[PDB]
Design a protein around this ligand. Structure first.
Ligand SMILES: [Zn+2]
Length: 142
């Protein structure tokens, strides 16, 4: 809803690995440390949908500025080995690169296109923001 709490699809919840808790990690149904994402069952009716598109443009929420920024990002590739306050020097998978304001506190924001959510905000800074594509997880049905 607000846009800073992960994705809630059906009875499942999607969040970043660096922002997850131990209980969620233990009960998670899918995890990708390289992509920095978890998928764990959640007892709720999700009102979100995953984008089954190839959109190259979208809008993301900047929590530390509390504003919506549109941006045209690059496709899902593997990115530079950088080290954060959470992580060691490593390269991430399914990374969408775009230009825009970002901060350490905004980790977890939502990127949306008309079809739905595309990815979560992994990290950003210095005018460059990187997201984790989640389009490969659109199990809306079973
Ligand atoms: Zn789209």
């Amino acid at each position: 809803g607000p846009g800073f709490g992960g994705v809630f699809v059906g009875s499942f919840k999607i969040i970043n690995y660096h922002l997850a808790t131990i209980e969620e990690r233990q009960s998670a149904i899918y995890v990708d440390w390289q992509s920095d994402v978890l998928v764990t069952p959640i007892a709720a009716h999700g009102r979100h949908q995953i984008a089954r598109c190839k959109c190259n443009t979208g809008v993301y929420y900047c929590r530390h500025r509390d504003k919506s920024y549109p941006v045209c990002f690059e496709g899902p590739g593997i990115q530079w080995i950088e080290q954060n306050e959470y992580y060691p020097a490593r390269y991430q998978t399914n990374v969408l690169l775009a230009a825009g304001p970002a901060e350490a506190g905004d980790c977890g924001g939502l990127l949306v296109c008309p079809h739905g959510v595309i990815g979560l905000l992994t990290a950003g800074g210095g005018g460059i923001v990187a997201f984790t594509d989640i389009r490969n997880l659109l199990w809306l049905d079973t």
